[PDB]
Amino acid sequence: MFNITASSSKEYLPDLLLFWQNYEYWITNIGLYKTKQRDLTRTPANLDTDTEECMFWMNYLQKDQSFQLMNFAMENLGALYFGSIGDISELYLRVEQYWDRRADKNHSVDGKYWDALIWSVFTMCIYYMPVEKLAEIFSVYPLHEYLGSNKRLNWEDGMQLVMCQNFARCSLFQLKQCDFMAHPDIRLVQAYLILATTTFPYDEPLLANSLLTQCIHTFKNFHVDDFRPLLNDDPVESIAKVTLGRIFYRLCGCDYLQSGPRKPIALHTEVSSLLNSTEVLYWKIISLDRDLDQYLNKSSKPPLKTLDAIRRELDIFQYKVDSLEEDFRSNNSRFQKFIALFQISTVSWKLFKMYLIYYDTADSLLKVIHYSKVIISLIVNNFHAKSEFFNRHPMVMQTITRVVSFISFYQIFVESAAVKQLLVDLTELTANLPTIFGSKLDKLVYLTERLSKLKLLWDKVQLLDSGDSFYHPVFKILQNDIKIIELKNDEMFSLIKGLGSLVPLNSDFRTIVEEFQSEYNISDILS
């Protein structure tokens, strides 16, 4: 963060924005979403629990409710399942079949694969449905009869998330009934790409990395490299290879979105960088974001040629996103254009943030404030147009996390009025994000509150210097926030606990640091 008497210089700012490029990664990428601290001696384990739970949550959903879910997905969620399963009109027959052999006792692997796929689709339906449509279809009372929770809470205060997580667990339990590890098939990859459009990769991040590893194992089992149709092939096989192409691009998207220390086996590294036709656009924007955010963990700063080439490609894909037609009647196309425009605004914000950090280019802070206002004007627009389920997509939690964390970090050190009004807008928007994110929204509010209280400590404590480095308690607290979470992401102690009888044994500056860390601990963004 920094590289005795006092001073008031600005040497710490170019060495501190480069520290933000490490802090953004190790907090807001890994420690907030991709770190699940676990204790195996405390965690329960039986199949006498998840069997009856899945029995209840499958006997709870009825036949008339499921087709209403599927109609909601057909009308409103067309931008999500098309990369995974294509057309959902083909899947009505499989829902009909699941209600045909629901009462049978001798199932097959193929049938339970279609059941797991449609229960992943049902999870996607429950996750993206507004509460006004969800309260009409379902009833809250048998769920409080079974779970034992108090009956005073409706869907809006954290009950839709419980049913979403339990339907995701039902899809995973039907995959376990498939014995999917003994039978690799594309329904595993499709059901996981449907489940990855929810907060399932952030509720169970170590399970989602194992499912993604099984999807990489299942996909590469087919050994299909090129997805272009050959003239000599059967025209069923060519459509099948186009289907694997549009599944492969979505799978590389999720493969990038789950990148971390707990996901070592990769697939997105085997796609070359750029340095239907709306599905490839999403992968182009995600690959450009992959080109940007690879500089977080590494220390080698990017060249200006790289950032300029990303800027020209950003303008090209900005024109391609702005050239997308949209119908205000067809809600699928509105959600499609929202996804494309929000992704390209996220990549634009990250690009001009890297301009501001790595080079301190003039008129780059104005670009960061401008694209942050563009992200706000994309999210606040959904509350006015009865499309509030647009703000449930997992990209708007990651992007708002990065944006409010950087604006809080920049408001700590560099004072500005536009940045302060932008921080007030980000705080109100983070308070106005949907409750389907659950605990991650509370942890983002806690992290924004912690970086706001750290501004007071930067104000009330004078910066010192030793002639070459700048000592301040805020700097040491920001060092230790990375040190603690890198300790939590160290699998050496779990290795020692796994091997057996090997047991692990382990001025006013330091006082201010320890009192702040005892009051605002960084281990409260963990679960």
In 3D, which of 310, 243, 254, 315 has the Cα closest to residue 282?
254
Of 130-149, binders to a second copy (CB under 8 A) are none
Q: Is 5 in the site for a second copy (CB under 8 A)?
A: no
Longest CA–CA separation in the chain, Å: 80
Whichever of 103 and 492 has its CB closer to a second copy, that residue is 492
Pairwise CA distance, residues 284 & 20, whole Å? 26
Q: Is 207 in the site for a second copy (CB under 8 A)?
A: yes
**Residue 181, C-beta contacts closer than 8 angstroms, at least 6 positions apart:** 214
Whichever of 221 and 273 has its CB closer to a second copy, that residue is 221
Pairwise CA distance, residues 80 & 86, whole Å? 9
Stretch that binds a second copy, among 180-188, 251-259, 378-386, 395-403 (CB under 8 A): 180-188
Of 426-455, binders to a second copy (CB under 8 A) are none
**Residue 214, C-beta contacts closer than 8 angstroms, at least 6 positions apart:** 180, 181, 184, 188
Position among 17, 168, 216, 354 found at the interface with a second copy (CB under 8 A): 216
Local structure of 5: helix, strand or coil? strand
Question: Residue 260: beta bridge partners?
Answer: 263
Nearest distance in Å: CB 243, a second copy = 6
Whichever of 231 and 505 has its CB closer to a second copy, that residue is 505
Pairwise CA distance, residues 176 & 104, whole Å? 18
Whichever of 14 and 245 has its CB closer to a second copy, that residue is 245
Q: Is 176 in the site for a second copy (CB under 8 A)?
A: yes
Of 71-90, binders to a second copy (CB under 8 A) are 90
How many CB atoms are located within 10 Å of the residue 203 CB?
Answer: 20
**Residue 188, C-beta contacts closer than 8 angstroms, at least 6 positions apart:** 113, 116, 175, 180, 211, 214, 215, 218
Q: Is 412 in the site for a second copy (CB under 8 A)?
A: no
Q: Is 269 in the site for a second copy (CB under 8 A)?
A: no
Position among 7, 22, 107, 514 found at the interface with a second copy (CB under 8 A): 107
Pairwise CA distance, residues 173 & 37, whole Å? 23
Q: Is 243 in the site for a second copy (CB under 8 A)?
A: yes
> What b/e string do you get for 250-270 counting C-beta neighbours within 10 Å, with b at 16 or more?
bbbbbbbbbbbebbeeebbee
Nearest distance in Å: CB 185, a second copy = 5
Whichever of 466 and 494 has its CB closer to a second copy, that residue is 494
Nearest distance in Å: CB 222, a second copy = 5
Position among 25, 81, 204, 422 found at the interface with a second copy (CB under 8 A): 204
Local structure of 132: helix, strand or coil? helix
Last residue before each gap in the chain (C to N over 2.5 A): 3, 275, 506
Integer distance in angstroms from the first to the last C-alpha of the chain?
A: 27
Q: Is 42 in the site for a second copy (CB under 8 A)?
A: yes
Nearest distance in Å: CB 234, a second copy = 6
Position among 37, 51, 276, 466 found at the interface with a second copy (CB under 8 A): 51
Nearest distance in Å: CB 491, a second copy = 5
Of 473-512, binders to a second copy (CB under 8 A) are 491-492, 494-506
Whichever of 168 and 307 has its CB closer to a second copy, that residue is 168
Nearest distance in Å: CB 45, a second copy = 4
Position among 6, 55, 181, 385 found at the interface with a second copy (CB under 8 A): 181
Nearest distance in Å: CB 277, a second copy = 20
Please tell me the count of residues contacting a second copy according to CB under 8 A: 73
Position among 101, 133, 144, 262 found at the interface with a second copy (CB under 8 A): 262
Whichever of 213 and 439 has its CB closer to a second copy, that residue is 213
SS3 assignment for 323-374: CCCCCCCCHHHHHHHHHHHHHHHHHHHHHHHHHHHHCCCCCCHHHHHHHHHH
